[PDB]
Amino acid sequence: AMNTDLKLPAGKTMTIEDVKQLLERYQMALKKTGEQLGWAYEQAAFPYTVRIHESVLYLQGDGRLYKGMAISVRTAGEETFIDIALPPGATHGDKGKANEFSKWLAKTLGGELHLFSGRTMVFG
Numbered sequence: 001a002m003n004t005d006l007k008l009p010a011g012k013t014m015t016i017e018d019v020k021q022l023l024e025r026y027q028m029a030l031k032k033t034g035e036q037l038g039w040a041y042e043q044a045a046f047p048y049t050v051r052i053h054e055s056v057l058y059l060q061g062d063g064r065l066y067k068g069m070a071i072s073v074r075t076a077g078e079e080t081f082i083d084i085a086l087p088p089g090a091t092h093g094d095k096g097k098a099n100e101f102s103k104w105l106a107k108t109l110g111g112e113l114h115l116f117s118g119r120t121m122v123f124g
Contacts (some may be wrong), residue, residue, distance in 0.1 A: 047097070065093045082109075086116070 047066045048059035057071040067089050074081040082105060084098050088122060099115065106113040110124040 045100075047093075060092070061094060065091055066097070067091055067094055069094055069098050 006048060047062040048068065049062070051058050051060070055072065059068045059071070061068045069087070069090065070085045072083050072085070074083050084097055084102055086094055090098075095116075102113060102115065103121070105123060106123050113121040113123070115121070
């Protein structure tokens with residue numbers, strides 16, 4: 001029913017095989033856009049800068065929506081724990097991010113996760 005055309009600049013020639021290469025190039029451009037979206041996901045999913053001070057990891061939150069948290073290792077008897085402490089001013093955002101990282105950590109290492117909601121999850 002309908003048609004679009006591009007009139008090429010004077011003197012420019014074009015074969016169907018050149019057009020096929022242009023379609024491939026277009027898909028390469030879409031891949032690059034896809035990478036930008038992925039990078040945007042990465043930055044939003046971990047909006048913290050990490051520093052270590054006195055064997056405690058401090059995450060400092062980007063912008064007003066994230067304050068931060070503190071991660072440390074605790075031993076008691078022959079037991080070992082990873083602790084994630086949220087400070088008094090911790091945001092809605094910080095709580096969610098801490099929950100996300102804690103669950104990933106538990107899936108990765110195994111053990112028994114005690115979430116600040118009072119829920120316990122066992123891996124193993």
